[PDB]
Amino acid sequence: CGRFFQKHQGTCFYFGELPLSLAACTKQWDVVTYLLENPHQPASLEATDSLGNTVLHALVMIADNSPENSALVIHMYDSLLQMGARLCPTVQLED
Amino acid sequence: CGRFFQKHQGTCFYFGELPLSLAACTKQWDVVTYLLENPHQPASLEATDSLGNTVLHALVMIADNSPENSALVIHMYDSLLQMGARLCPTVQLEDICNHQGLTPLKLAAKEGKIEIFRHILQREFSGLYQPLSRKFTEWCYGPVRVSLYDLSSVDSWEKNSVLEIIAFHCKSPHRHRMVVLEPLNKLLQEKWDRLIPRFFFNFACYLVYMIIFTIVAYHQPSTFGDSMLLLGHILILLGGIYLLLGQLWYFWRRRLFIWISFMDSYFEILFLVQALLTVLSQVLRFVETEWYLPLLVSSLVLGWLNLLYYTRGFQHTGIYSVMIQKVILRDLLRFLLVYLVFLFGFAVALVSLSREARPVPYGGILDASLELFKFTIGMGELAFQEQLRFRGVVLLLLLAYVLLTYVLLLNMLIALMSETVNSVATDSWSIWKLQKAISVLEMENGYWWCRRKRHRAGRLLKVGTKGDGIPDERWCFRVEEVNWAAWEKTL
Amino acid sequence: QALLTVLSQVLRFVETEWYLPLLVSSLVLGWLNLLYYTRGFQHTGIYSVMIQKVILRDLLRFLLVYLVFLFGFAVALVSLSREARPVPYGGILDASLELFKFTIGMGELAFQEQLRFRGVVLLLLLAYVLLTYVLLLNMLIALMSETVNSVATDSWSIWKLQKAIS
Numbered sequence: 118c119g120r121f122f123q124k125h126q127g128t129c130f131y132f133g134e135l136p137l138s139l140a141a142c143t144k145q146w147d148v149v150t151y152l153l154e155n156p157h158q159p160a161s162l163e164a165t166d167s168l169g170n171t172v173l174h175a176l177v178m179i180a181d182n183s184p185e186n187s188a189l190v191i192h193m194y195d196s197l198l199q200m201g202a203r204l205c206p207t208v209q210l211e212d
Numbered sequence: 213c214g215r216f217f218q219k220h221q222g223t224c225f226y227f228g229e230l231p232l233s234l235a236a237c238t239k240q241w242d243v244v245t246y247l248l249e250n251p252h253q254p255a256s257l258e259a260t261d262s263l264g265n266t267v268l269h270a271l272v273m274i275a276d277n278s279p280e281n282s283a284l285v286i287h288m289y290d291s292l293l294q295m296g297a298r299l300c301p302t303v304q305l306e307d308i309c310n311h312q313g314l315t316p317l318k319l320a321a322k323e324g325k326i327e328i329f330r331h332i333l334q335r336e337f338s339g340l341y342q343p344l345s346r347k348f349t350e351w352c353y354g355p356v357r358v359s360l361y362d363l364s365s366v367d368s369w370e371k372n373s374v375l376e377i378i379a380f381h382c383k384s385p386h387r388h389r390m391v392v393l394e395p396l397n398k399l400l401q402e403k404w405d406r407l408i409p410r411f412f413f414n415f416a417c418y419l420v421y422m423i424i425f426t427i428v429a430y431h432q433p434s435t436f437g438d439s440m441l442l443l444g445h446i447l448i449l450l451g452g453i454y455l456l457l458g459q460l461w462y463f464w465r466r467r468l469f470i471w472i473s474f475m476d477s478y479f480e481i482l483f484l485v486q487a488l489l490t491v492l493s494q495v496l497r498f499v500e501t502e503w504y505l506p507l508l509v510s511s512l513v514l515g516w517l518n519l520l521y522y523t524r525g526f527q528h529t530g531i532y533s534v535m536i537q538k539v540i541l542r543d544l545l546r547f548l549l550v551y552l553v554f555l556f557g558f559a560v561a562l563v564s565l566s567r568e569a570r571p572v573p574y575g576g577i578l579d580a581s582l583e584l585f586k587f588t589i590g591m592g593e594l595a596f597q598e599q600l601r602f603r604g605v606v607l608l609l610l611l612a613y614v615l616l617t618y619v620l621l622l623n624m625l626i627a628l629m630s631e632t633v634n635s636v637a638t639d640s641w642s643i644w645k646l647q648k649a650i651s652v653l654e655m656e657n658g659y660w661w662c663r664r665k666r667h668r669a670g671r672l673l674k675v676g677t678k679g680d681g682i683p684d685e686r687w688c689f690r691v692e693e694v695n696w697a698a699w700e701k702t703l
Numbered sequence: 704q705a706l707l708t709v710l711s712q713v714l715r716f717v718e719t720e721w722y723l724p725l726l727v728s729s730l731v732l733g734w735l736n737l738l739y740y741t742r743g744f745q746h747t748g749i750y751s752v753m754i755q756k757v758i759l760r761d762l763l764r765f766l767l768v769y770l771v772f773l774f775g776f777a778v779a780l781v782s783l784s785r786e787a788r789p790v791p792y793g794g795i796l797d798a799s800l801e802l803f804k805f806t807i808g809m810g811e812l813a814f815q816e817q818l819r820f821r822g823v824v825l826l827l828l829l830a831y832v833l834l835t836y837v838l839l840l841n842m843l844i845a846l847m848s849e850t851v852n853s854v855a856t857d858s859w860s861i862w863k864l865q866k867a868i869s
């Protein structure tokens with residue numbers, strides 16, 4: 118939670134300032150997997166950022182109407198939702 | 213150096229009249245290599261032709277906007293630059309002023325070559341030959357790109373620049389499309405944003421001057437009031453002389469411009485005319501001449517019309533002004549020519565008739581012309597004059613005039629301006645951006661009296677290390693852009 | 704419209720002569736407001752949306768340029784026609800109204816013989832007509848053709864959004 122990562126005008130890139138949200142917004146299919154299924158300390162998926170956004174919120178935030186950006190956002194959104202269902206079904210991430 | 217090879221009109225082909233330049237312009241990949249690396253007598257690469265062009269200059273000159281020609285020129289330009297770096301790195305080929313004092317980039321800008329111009333304007337290579345790059349990328353943290361476009365030979369700080377060449381020295385038909393390329397469109401936008409305060413200050417000063425001029429003209433001769441009138445009059449004279457000097461200095465400092473594009477500016481002409489009419493009006497008043505008032509009032513009208521020079525500091529209204537200009541210059545002068553031919557013919561016809569009976573209508577040519585124009589503006593008197601002996605002929609002649617002029621030509625003029633407004637929609641935007649570019653470039657240098665201090669845009673950012681010891685520096689235009697198509701390929 | 708109506712009534716209670724302009728403005732504005740309702744229909748709602756786009760896109764620019772022209776030429780004609788050899792162009796309001804008359808097809812384009820700058824006044828009027836009636840009005844028709852063509856699908860979508868809001 119600094120100044121470059123926080124959403125503002127100028128030099129910036131918003132990704133939720135979470136390592137898992139960074140991996141998701143940066144198309145790291147494997148990093149997110151390791152963070153989620155590392156035995157030493159599994160990485161939570163419901164974790165919110167200082168602004169209140171979750172990985173899904175942030176992954177929407179970077180979404181832009183570019184066809185390639187839209188494809189990336191859709192793919193990672195669906196895949197991360199599926200993973201969230203697989204790991205901890207008891208909690209509904211969409212809400 | 214003969215006649216066929218020299219650039220002229222007719223049977224010709226310019227290639228720099230050097231064997232190496234000939235090989236380069238003729239896609240001789242191998243001959244150039246042998247000339248450069250023949251052990252017996254290596255061929256120099258910096259060699260200039262009688263005109264001052266080098267091989268790179270020549271590759272620019274033959275450049276045309278054909279996709280195949282552009283591809284050929286780009287490929288040979290890049291490859292030859294790489295070879296020049298490989299053979300003799302110590303000498304920088306991109307910076308070789310020919311006899312006209314133009315580098316290959318400036319030469320491409322002046323000669324209208326757009327594809328080679330944009331390519332040179334934004335190019336990058338791999339680690340090797342990296343210094344021979346104009347666009348860079350410092351870091352790509354995330355999907356953002358910090359593009360650093362080289363501003364060498366393109367910023368306005370230098371005496372002669374690509375921006376100035378495009379604005380004033382280029383005579384290409386559509387040079388307005390080179391000021392929308394990435395570096396130029398962003399740098400020019402930043403400069404415009406920085407200059408909005410001065411653009412509005414110039415607008416406000418001119419508007420105040422025109423308000424004073426209107427007030428003075430409204431209250432003139434046909435104590436305190438006399439004193440205020442006098443100070444306003446002298447203020448108007450001083451303002452008129454100021455605008456006259458400004459326009460005269462715009463022309464003298466830029467005396468090599470009218471011949472390129474007379475109608476590109478076409479407000480410095482109008483501003484000059486308005487200022488001239490103002491000062492001439494004042495001097496004739498000193499002479500106590502009755503021809504004062506027409507000149508002062510013409511100055512008033514023309515100044516109020518000139519305000520629409522300023523009305524185009526806005527996207528919304530500047531494109532409207534550009535498109536008014538296109539309408540006038542495209543499908544209003546033709547209409548006026550045809551309409552005036554019709555009107556003169558029918559006016560002299562009606563005057564010839566209506567001269568024999570059985571307050572005379574159509575008394576002379578002026579009256580008949582004015583009645584016909586009245587038809588044009590929606591108040592033509594179309595009656596059956598019973599007094600003149602050719603009632604029917606005059607009526608039929610008027611009806612024919614109405615059909616040919618009001619029903620046909622005016623409505624067709626509406627149709628033609630619909631067509632022209634539709635035609636010039638994107639070009640209007642580009643031309644407006646060029647107008648902003650010209651205004652910015654004029655605002656950068658101060659007024660004709662104030663020697664403005666330059667402000668050199670860009671950052672002196674150390675980029676890479678040259679093929680030497682102690683490193684180098686270079687001024688670049690730092691640009692942020694969010695990209696995902698490129699980002700998916702950097703993994 | 705509602706504010707003007709209530710304010711009109713209270714001023715009537717005050718017995719003020721500025722009642723009638725306010726009440727009549729409320730009347731005009733309410734009758735114009737009825738076009739809010741006229742867009743419960745596909746046929747007419749898109750028309751209303753596209754009227755709005757025309758006004759906001761290529762009517763305010765025309766008004767700005769036209770009023771600059773008109774003020775310049777009106778003060779010019781008033782400055783002239785003030786020295787001879789019911790005075791036309793007596794003041795700024797009269798000259799402006801005559802020029803607008805030109806705009807609406809009712810412009811008196813005569814050769815005033817009484818004033819000493821007959822030719823200058825006539826040429827100035829002819830230039831005003833060429834710049835305004837022949838160029839700017841017909842060009843406004845062309846611009847509104849261009850805007851009507853531009854906003855055809857967007858008009859449908861905007862009308863559907865208007866229905867959604869209602």
Ligand SMILES: NCCOB(c1ccccc1)c1ccccc1
Nearest residue numbers: 517518520533536537540768834
């Ligand atoms: N808005 C018109 C201002 O003056 B325009 C005009 C005035 C006098 C002579 C001819 C035309 C002119 C300049 C701008 C665009 C095109 C024509």
Ligand SMILES: NCCOB(c1ccccc1)c1ccccc1
Nearest residue numbers: 735736738751754755756758759
């Ligand atoms: N159809 C015009 C009705 O009133 B319009 C109008 C009335 C008063 C002031 C300005 C314009 C208006 C409302 C709808 C669309 C845009 C303008």
